[PDB]
Amino acid sequence: MLVLVLGDLHIPHRCNSLPAKFKKLLVPGKIQHILCTGNLCTKESYDYLKTLAGDVHIVRGDFDENLNYPEQKVVTVGQFKIGLIHGHQVIPWGDMASLALLQRQFDVDILISGHTHKFEAFEHENKFYINPGSATGAYNALETNIIPSFVLMDIQASTVVTYVYQLIGDDVKVERIEYKKS
């Protein structure tokens, strides 16, 4: 199975569109799951995602018009448990009851969140961590010249191959990272 991972698009307030160079790469009939970190911002973009795959999992960002999106999800895709949360949430570590609830979200094979608009892909202690960045390169509270990125995970048994797509200049650059659980 192929999994699309994206978010922080902020369409249409900050960006009018997915960049054509990313949007070219996506087509109905290839992707089995989408894991979206939120801030799409609007139903137009959600419907687009639904043309691409039959299993669409979205979490609620802080600028999303739709409040029916759940705050956080744990989702099974093949052999992997995947924790998904946007990340704009302000939660102090010392609220112990909240912390006990967060054990669920950390006790996952792959952790995905957004919010910072800086991509990350790495292995740490038998788990994998992804922030897909912002698929439109939208600005954050912090920064203005953010590089658009998104991710595809190619999942096969207990191997994930993560592909990070970045729009640097005129070209798409792709980094490929292999993870095997155990």
Side-chain angles (χ1 to χ4, degrees):
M1 333 116 199
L2 198 61
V3 182
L4 169 65
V5 183
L6 84 174
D8 292 309
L9 322 190
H10 292 276
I11 294 155
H13 293 157
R14 307 196 186 168
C15 306
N16 91 290
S17 256
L18 245 20
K21 293 196 174 161
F22 287 171
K23 203 190 177 180
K24 275 176 200 225
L25 303 175
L26 309 176
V27 73
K30 295 299 204 192
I31 300 145
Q32 290 70 53
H33 313 283
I34 297 166
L35 302 189
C36 176
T37 48
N39 279 348
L40 281 177
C41 270
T42 249
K43 158 160 180 205
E44 188 198 66
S45 280
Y46 181 50
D47 287 341
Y48 169 67
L49 294 177
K50 271 138 78 203
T51 76
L52 293 175
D55 198 38
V56 180
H57 295 300
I58 180 164
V59 287
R60 186 178 174 278
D62 46 341
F63 293 80
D64 272 312
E65 293 183 347
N66 190 341
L67 262 93
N68 296 180
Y69 299 156
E71 282 276 302
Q72 65 203 264
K73 272 254 250 266
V74 179
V75 174
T76 298
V77 184
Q79 286 159 39
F80 295 94
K81 294 207 203 196
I82 311 192
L84 178 63
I85 185 177
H86 176 88
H88 65 267
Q89 293 90 353
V90 179
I91 293 301
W93 178 282
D95 179 347
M96 310 309 285
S98 304
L99 210 61
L101 269 156
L102 256 19
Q103 292 276 3
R104 283 188 73 239
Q105 279 293 322
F106 278 73
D107 183 22
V108 122
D109 300 307
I110 313 184
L111 282 86
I112 305 180
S113 48
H115 180 69
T116 64
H117 300 202
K118 317 215 90 198
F119 99 90
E120 294 178 85
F122 66 79
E123 176 178 345
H124 184 282
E125 301 293 291
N126 209 27
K127 291 166 166 39
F128 205 79
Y129 289 76
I130 299 166
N131 184 330
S134 159
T136 57
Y139 74 77
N140 213 11
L142 260 230
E143 242 191 281
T144 275
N145 310 277
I146 279 165
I147 293 151
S149 55
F150 77 97
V151 159
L152 291 163
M153 301 185 300
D154 188 359
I155 299 175
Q156 310 199 305
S158 70
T159 309
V160 187
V161 184
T162 296
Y163 297 93
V164 180
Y165 299 82
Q166 285 179 102
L167 226 204
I168 283 151
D170 257 283
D171 293 340
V172 181
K173 304 216 251 143
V174 192
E175 225 198 286
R176 191 194 113 98
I177 319 185
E178 273 234 320
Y179 161 66
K180 316 208 225 169
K181 188 197 165 153
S182 264

